[PDB]
Amino acid sequence: TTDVVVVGGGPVGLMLAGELRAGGVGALVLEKLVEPVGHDRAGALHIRTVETLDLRGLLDRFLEGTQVAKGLPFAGIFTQGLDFGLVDTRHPYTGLVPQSRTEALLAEHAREAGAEIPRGHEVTRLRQDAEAVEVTVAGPSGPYPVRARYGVGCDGGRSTVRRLAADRFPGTEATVRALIGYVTTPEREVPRRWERTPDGILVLAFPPGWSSSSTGHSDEGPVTLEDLGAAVARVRGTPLTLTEPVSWLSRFGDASRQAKRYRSGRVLLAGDAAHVHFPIGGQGLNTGLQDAVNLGWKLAARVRGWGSEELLDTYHDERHPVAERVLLNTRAQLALMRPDEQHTTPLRGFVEELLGTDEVNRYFTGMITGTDVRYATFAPASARPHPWPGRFAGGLVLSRPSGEPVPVAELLRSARPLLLDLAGRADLREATRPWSDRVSVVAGEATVEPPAQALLVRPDGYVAWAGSPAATADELRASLARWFGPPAN
């Protein structure tokens, strides 16, 4: 009676709302807070994310803010930063876009897309039936129930929705404290502006923003200014700090927890509600948005009819393995940034040396920026899959008449699966007539590397099925029926 209800007006939530509308489904976002607050957590959108935004024509809107970094760094190692030039991408850079500004854009997009955004409605409880779900809400006018076919949790890390459906979501206890907060130019008139990793902690100051991580800290009331000064026990000179009017200033730990199932019947999880990690390398919102886009088109499909149950299960099948690795890279990154001068500095030396290597630099570059993600869904047996299944195609360019460059990124904005003819294969095209909602665009791309004559491309940029010369129409027939349900009458 109200299609799909997403809980949380965060980035992930707004994104998911857009993809649901772009997918022809009613979206409803209930956001706890009333006046959005990003401030801290100042954001940074990496390549795979940026590439993804291009598939939605949203990239143009984010480039008014001067992104940059081509790119680096990694675990406080600056001498040999991550070089984006080593990975195949049409967008070899990161969008330095403050999360506050990001939410602003995503909200505006969902508003115009036709999705209600009541800001100021916390969710008290839930209840999952066999056909639909009901969420108890607490609005200014007062409480009220709400029915919808599916409910997705896109709130914070303390997701109530995760609680109310019981999902754990194990993870590790925090042993790293990190206090941050903006406080411009109090004492000293031009200290320093380096990261610096003393013995006892690692600080990061800036004047004409302070950040301090302590390793080995597990009753506490909210965090105070004087709380931050002593936290700078890592430095000799004791600025602390001072005032200097306060701004935001928060505290963060290195608990690495993650939902054991992204799905529980007809409840789903995304963004921080599904994975929680230390804020190192700015992978949080990146992983979230991509979770959203991966689910959006899949869920919208399930609702409208063609989206099968198997299809929805793949959301977790694909996105869980990804976040696992994020939690791990952040935990290992912390090991590399450890405040030990006796073993860890030596190690950092060697590691910096390997970041000089293209092979290894490309590796960590891929891990962080997301370019390394490839899915493994709906593989046959016995008949090994093509080299293109799961690979990302959102960054290809086509041509054909006149030799005009035609970005596949622009063709996915329709939010519909594609079939790229690349070479010339009409047998496959004709086998795809019965669709609705898959379009067949004909072109001619030489790469195709490894070679490929056809690419069944998902709404999210990733390839679902790929065709070599030997691929018959009958093979593709089944691949469509499985990915996008039965043909027309």
Residue list for the binding site for FAD: 12, 31, 44, 99, 123, 160, 272, 282, 285-286
Say how far apart CA 477 and CA 466 lie, in whole Å: 12
Q: Please state the closest distance from residue 305 (CB atom) to ligand FAD, in A.
A: 28
| Residue 454 DSSP class | E
Question: Residue 44, interface with ligand FAD (CB under 6 A)?
Answer: yes
- Could you tell which of ligand FAD, a second copy, none binds residue 175, using a CB distance below 5 to 8 A set by kind? a second copy
Piece of 20-28, 286-294, 333-341, 420-428 that binds a second copy (CB under 8 A):
333-341
Say how far apart CA 152 and CA 300 lie, in whole Å: 12
C-alpha separations of 189 from 238, 249, 300 in Å: 14, 22, 56
- What would the x/- binding string for a second copy be over residues 159 to 198, using CB under 8 A? -------------x--x-----------------------
Question: Residue 360, interface with a second copy (CB under 8 A)?
Answer: yes
Question: Residue 319, interface with ligand FAD (CB under 6 A)?
Answer: no
Q: Please state the closest distance from residue 385 (CB atom) to ligand FAD, in A.
A: 30
- Could you tell which of ligand FAD, a second copy, none binds residue 437, using a CB distance below 5 to 8 A set by kind? none
- Could you tell which of ligand FAD, a second copy, none binds residue 391, using a CB distance below 5 to 8 A set by kind? none
CA 432, 438, 443, 447 dihedral sign is: negative
Which helix (H) or strand (E) segment holds residue 455: the answer is strand 454-457
Say how far apart CA 203 and CA 181 lie, in whole Å: 12
Residues 6+ apart with CB under 8 A from 295: 16, 19, 152, 268, 270, 315, 319
Question: Residue 251, interface with ligand FAD (CB under 6 A)?
Answer: no
Among 39, 196, 338, 413, binds a second copy (CB under 8 A): 338
Alpha helices (H) along 370-472: 408-411, 426-430
Question: Residue 246, interface with a second copy (CB under 8 A)?
Answer: no
Interhelix angle for 284-304 vs 11-22, to 10°? 30
- Could you tell which of a second copy, ligand FAD, none binds residue 9, using a CB distance below 5 to 8 A set by kind? ligand FAD
Residue count of the chain, please give it. 489
Say how far apart CA 407 and CA 109 lie, in whole Å: 22
- Could you tell which of ligand FAD, a second copy, none binds residue 354, using a CB distance below 5 to 8 A set by kind? a second copy
Question: Residue 306, interface with a second copy (CB under 8 A)?
Answer: no
Contact 387, 466 (CB under 8 A): yes
| Residues 252-281 contacting a second copy, CB under 8 A | 254
Question: Residue 67, interface with ligand FAD (CB under 6 A)?
Answer: no
Question: Residue 336, interface with a second copy (CB under 8 A)?
Answer: yes
Say how far apart CA 369 and CA 86 lie, in whole Å: 12
- What would the x/- binding string for ligand FAD be over residues 87 to 106, using CB under 6 A? ------------x-------
Contact 290, 315 (CB under 8 A): no
- Could you tell which of ligand FAD, a second copy, none binds residue 487, using a CB distance below 5 to 8 A set by kind? none
- Could you tell which of a second copy, ligand FAD, none binds residue 86, using a CB distance below 5 to 8 A set by kind? none
- Could you tell which of ligand FAD, a second copy, none binds residue 460, using a CB distance below 5 to 8 A set by kind? none
Question: Residue 282, interface with ligand FAD (CB under 6 A)?
Answer: yes
Q: How many CA atoms lie within 13 A of 126 on its CB side?
A: 26
Q: Please state the closest distance from residue 355 (CB atom) to a second copy, in A.
A: 11
Residues 6+ apart with CB under 8 A from 217: 175, 176, 177
Q: Please state the closest distance from residue 329 (CB atom) to a second copy, in A.
A: 7
Biggest CA–CA distance in the chain, Å, is 78
Task: Say how many residues touch a second copy, by CB under 8 A.
Answer: 24
Q: Please state the closest distance from residue 288 (CB atom) to ligand FAD, in A.
A: 4
Question: Residue 354, interface with a second copy (CB under 8 A)?
Answer: yes
Q: What letter represents residue 374's amino acid?
A: R
C-alpha separations of 362 from 71, 85, 286, 356 in Å: 12, 9, 19, 10
Say how far apart CA 301 and CA 352 lie, in whole Å: 46
Contact 419, 457 (CB under 8 A): yes
- The token duo for 318 is 């694909």
Q: Please state the closest distance from residue 434 (CB atom) to ligand FAD, in A.
A: 38
**Residues of the shown chain interacting with a second copy in the complex, contacts defined by CB under 8 A:** 172, 175, 254, 328-329, 331-332, 334-336, 338, 340, 342-344, 346-347, 349-350, 354, 357, 359-360, 363
**Residues of the shown chain interacting with ligand FAD in the complex, contacts defined by CB under 6 A:** 7-13, 30-33, 40-41, 43-44, 99, 122-123, 154-156, 160, 180, 252, 271-273, 279, 282-286, 288
